[PDB]
Design a protein around this ligand. Structure first.
Ligand SMILES: *[C@@H]1O[C@H](CO)[C@@H](O[C@@H]2O[C@H](CO)[C@@H](O)[C@H](O)[C@H]2NC(C)=O)[C@H](O)[C@H]1NC(C)=O
Ligand SMILES: *[C@@H]1O[C@H](CO)[C@@H](O[C@@H]2O[C@H](CO)[C@@H](O)[C@H](O)[C@H]2NC(C)=O)[C@H](O)[C@H]1NC(C)=O
Ligand SMILES: *[C@@H]1O[C@H](CO)[C@@H](O)[C@H](O)[C@H]1NC(C)=O
Lengths: 57, 50
């Protein structure tokens, strides 16, 4: 939604474009459009869903 | 000068005009082809219009 995806070599994070401030990638940081077969250079990772732990417990 | 992939640079350029970056990424080939054709048209104009 804002910022870019970065990787320190082992983990992927999202951070604002003008200042390194890594955050866990969640559904509140990103948006969904299309699928994996269209975007050139898309990488595999996981997106944390803040709702899941609230309903699991 | 902070290196950035050109496609991501264009993603920022698109966000700056109110067009969500997924439009760029989904249409990256079309946009690149339109850019190359526009450049070719610039070449033809400069080579033909005194
Ligand atoms: C990339 O970032 C991740 C996330 O912080 C790092 O993983 C952590 O590393 C520290 C040690 O520096 C551990 O104490 C944490 O438990 C790790 N957390 C997880 C979730 O793995 C990772 O080490 C970083 N990689 C580099 C090369 O710095
Ligand atoms: C990212 O993950 C997807 C699956 O989540 C990978 O897609 C697989 O691609 C291989 C190669 O054609 C297929 O044989 C598999 O069947 C695909 N998976 C599924 C679930 O259909 C994709 O290749 C991965 N990309 C990278 C760069 O790791
Ligand atoms: C980046 O370019 C290299 C070749 O220099 C290529 O092997 C690699 O797959 C490319 N990655 C992406 C995401 O386009």
């Amino acid at each position: 939604r804002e910022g870019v995806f970065v990787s320190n070599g082992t983990h992927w994070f999202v951070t604002q474009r003008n200042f390194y401030e890594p955050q866990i990638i969640t559904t509140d940081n990103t948006f969904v459009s299309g699928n994996c077969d269209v975007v050139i250079g898309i990488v595999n990772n996981t997106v944390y869903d803040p709702l899941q732990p609230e309903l699991d417990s | 000068a902070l290196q950035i992939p050109f496609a991501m640079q264009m993603a920022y350029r698109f966000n700056g005009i109110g067009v969500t970056q997924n439009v760029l990424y989904e249409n990256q080939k079309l946009i690149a082809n339109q850019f190359n054709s526009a450049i070719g048209k610039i070449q033809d104009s400069l080579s033909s219009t005194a």
